[PDB]
């Protein structure tokens, strides 16, 4: 494109893994540059409810989003924050896990 400099690189290789219908694992490949924090913004891809957001220590390139629903993906939008500014946002929809457990009903 027109604008583009070698300094701020957004998180790529997004991988949404669902291990539980109450939480969804999500990771990515961190850049070489020093990143202050990772502004995560997950929400219902569908687009019916409000938008959420959870902070994460740049130190790690992954984070789990608890309090999630079942059989429902989530548009995870991550963004690398730098001293100068934050890079673009990368979206990624990942269907959650299905409900399964012992019940006497």
Curated annotation (Swiss-Prot):
Residues annotated as transmembrane: none
Cell compartment(s), UniProt: Secreted, Extracellular space
Protein origin, superkingdom: Eukaryota
Tissue localization of expression: High expression in heart, lung, liver, skeletal muscle, kidney, pancreas, spleen, testis, ovary, subthalamic nucleus and fetal liver. Weak expression in other tissues tested.
Domain Fibronectin type-III: 10-99
Protein purpose: Probable collagen protein.
Protein name: Collagen alpha-1(XX) chain
Organism: Homo sapiens (Human)
Residue span relative to the full protein: 741 to 832 of 1284
